[PDB]
Design a protein around this ligand. Structure first.
Ligand code: HEM
Ligand SMILES: O=C(CCCCn1ccnc1)N[C@@H](Cc1ccccc1)C(=O)O
Ligand SMILES: CCCc1ccccc1
Length: 454
């Protein structure tokens, strides 16, 4: 089979199609038109976008395909280095850091993060309890405040104090600007053109702001003494069982940058989309709120109670199905192979997995794919293999998945226990694309049920 390809622009090939504010949504529309696979070419680059479970289930075979750094990840590697998310599987520091940090995400470790997650969640609840009559909530803004504070505290015992601020923390301003610059480089035909000198100077400044915070985090800890048993503790003291080695100092700094970014951005999108879908689907909101009231019987949730918020967990997975907030990942062929019995690939050929489109495969989910129905997730064994991939694949899947879902279930459960919510503007979904996806401008009103936190 010859695969289709979207419209071209002479020698720029397909690259101008991604010169848009919303490239993932542009790629979803191409997939809608062209189907389960299309060729995408740019000057000096070829990739193939996959959208069907039929093909992606083959692409997830780790004996045939390994993680590729997309151009986005390659440009982010200029400040995330060989941290876990921007390392190749074959670099020594990938497996070393993977082995050292996996126990920081055990369910036992989650039991230890729980109290600090509650600390920040209570700050969010108190903020909303303290709003005056007919004031409203800026939803992604507050969810980002929460997820940033949670990864700083839980992981590094650093307080960003986001709920004390209107303007984002300087780290965020620089992080956002550095991520946007990295992604802008994709469209630059002549990146050494002097027109980009200011962009380059600004990029170095933003990387320095980020690295200054990492130095502060490391110096604060080395003063305090090893007595926090958190992520930084393992980054500073853990030894890889295979090599016997600890992480070196340069790699630790890259991990701190990696986790501060990865540990907050897509989780804030997930919580924002989950609240969006609940207020748009009030029967679902009512069922989730009934579960919260029944389970969360104490002034703050326990670790076990969060594990018992089954339906809330289903709500989160169904929000990840429609808007997976880390919406793509890239693979390369380890050897010559044939995809789907129809598309021969050579060793080194690249693939992109377009996760939001995979999650709309009607052969898997039925024709009602656009509807919000958490009950699709009642049973993992009823979901075909590789049909649902919001956390990636295989040994390169998200190391933070359980942290993200514990945090999001805790927070959404407390939100549903403590407030009734109103979609007072009849909000029209507008999805902003950065490193992640978020519903821009999403606002609600939250009426307190007046249930105390002490
Ligand atoms: C709802 C929230 C999240 C989503 C949807 C998400 C999604 C993903 C995806 C799709 C990947 C694979 C990327 C690729 O193959 O290129 C990944 C990897 C990773 N994520 Fe997440 N993530 C989330 C939360 C987190 C959190 C909370 C952390 C840290 C606490 C984290 C840290 C990482 C890291 C370090 C990797 C690289 C893992 C490796 O390759 O060894 N993520 N994430
Ligand atoms: O593939 C990634 C990188 C996604 C990173 C996902 N992520 C987030 C957190 N962890 C992982 N972008 C997509 C979409 C895109 C295209 C052009 C410009 C910008 C974006 C692509 O290049 O096709
Ligand atoms: C896949 C984790 C998100 C991330 C974090 C830092 C740098 C690149 C990607």
């Amino acid at each position: 089979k010859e695969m289709p390809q979207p419209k071209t622009f002479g020698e720029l090939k397909n690259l101008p199609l991604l010169n848009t504010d919303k490239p993932v949504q542009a790629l979803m529309k191409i997939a809608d038109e062209l189907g389960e696979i299309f060729k995408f070419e740019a000057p000096g680059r070829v990739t193939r976008y996959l959208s069907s479970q039929r093909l992606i289930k083959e692409a997830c075979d780790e004996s045939r395909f390994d993680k590729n750094l997309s151009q986005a990840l390659k440009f982010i590697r200029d400040f995330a280095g060989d941290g876990l998310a921007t390392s190749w599987t074959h670099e020594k520091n990938w497996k070393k850091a993977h082995n050292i940090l996996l126990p920081s995400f055990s369910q036992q470790a989650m039991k230890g993060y729980h109290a600090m997650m509650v600390d920040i969640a209570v700050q969010l609840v108190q903020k909303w309890e303290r709003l005056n009559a007919d004031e409203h909530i800026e939803v992604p803004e507050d969810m980002t405040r929460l997820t940033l504070d949670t990864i700083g505290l839980c992981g590094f015992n650093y307080r960003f104090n986001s709920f004390y601020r209107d303007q984002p923390h300087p780290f965020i301003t620089s992080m956002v600007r550095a991520l946007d610059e990295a992604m802008n480089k994709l469209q630059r035909a002549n990146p050494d053109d002097p027109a980009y000198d200011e962009n380059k100077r600004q990029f170095q400044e933003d990387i320095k702001v980020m690295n200054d915070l990492v130095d502060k985090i490391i110096a604060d800890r080395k003063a305090s003494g090893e007595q926090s048993d958190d992520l930084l503790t393992h980054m500073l003291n853990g030894k890889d069982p295979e090599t016997g080695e600890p992480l070196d100092d340069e790699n630790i700094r890259y991990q701190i940058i990696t986790f501060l970014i990865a540990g907050h951005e897509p989780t804030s999108g997930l919580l924002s989309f989950a609240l969006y879908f609940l207020v748009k689907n009030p029967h679902v909101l009512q069922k989730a709120a009934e579960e919260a009231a029944r389970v969360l019987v104490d002034p703050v949730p326990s670790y076990k109670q969060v594990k018992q918020l089954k339906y809330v967990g289903m709500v989160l997975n169904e929000a990840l199905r429609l808007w997976p907030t880390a919406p793509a990942f890239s693979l390369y062929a380890k050897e010559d192979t044939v995809l789907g019995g129809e598309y021969p690939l050579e060793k080194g050929d690249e693939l992109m997995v377009l996760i939001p489109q995979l999650h709309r495969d009607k052969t898997i989910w039925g024709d009602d794919v656009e509807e919000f129905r958490p009950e699709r997730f009642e049973n993992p064994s009823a979901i075909p293999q590789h049909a649902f991939k919001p956390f990636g694949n295989g040994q390169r899947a998200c190391i933070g998945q359980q942290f993200a879902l514990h945090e999001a279930t805790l927070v959404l459960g407390m939100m549903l226990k403590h407030f009734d919510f109103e979609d007072h503007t009849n909000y029209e979904l507008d999805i902003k694309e950065t490193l992640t996806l978020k519903p821009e401008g999403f606002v609600v009103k939250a009426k307190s049920k007046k249930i105390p936190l002490l």
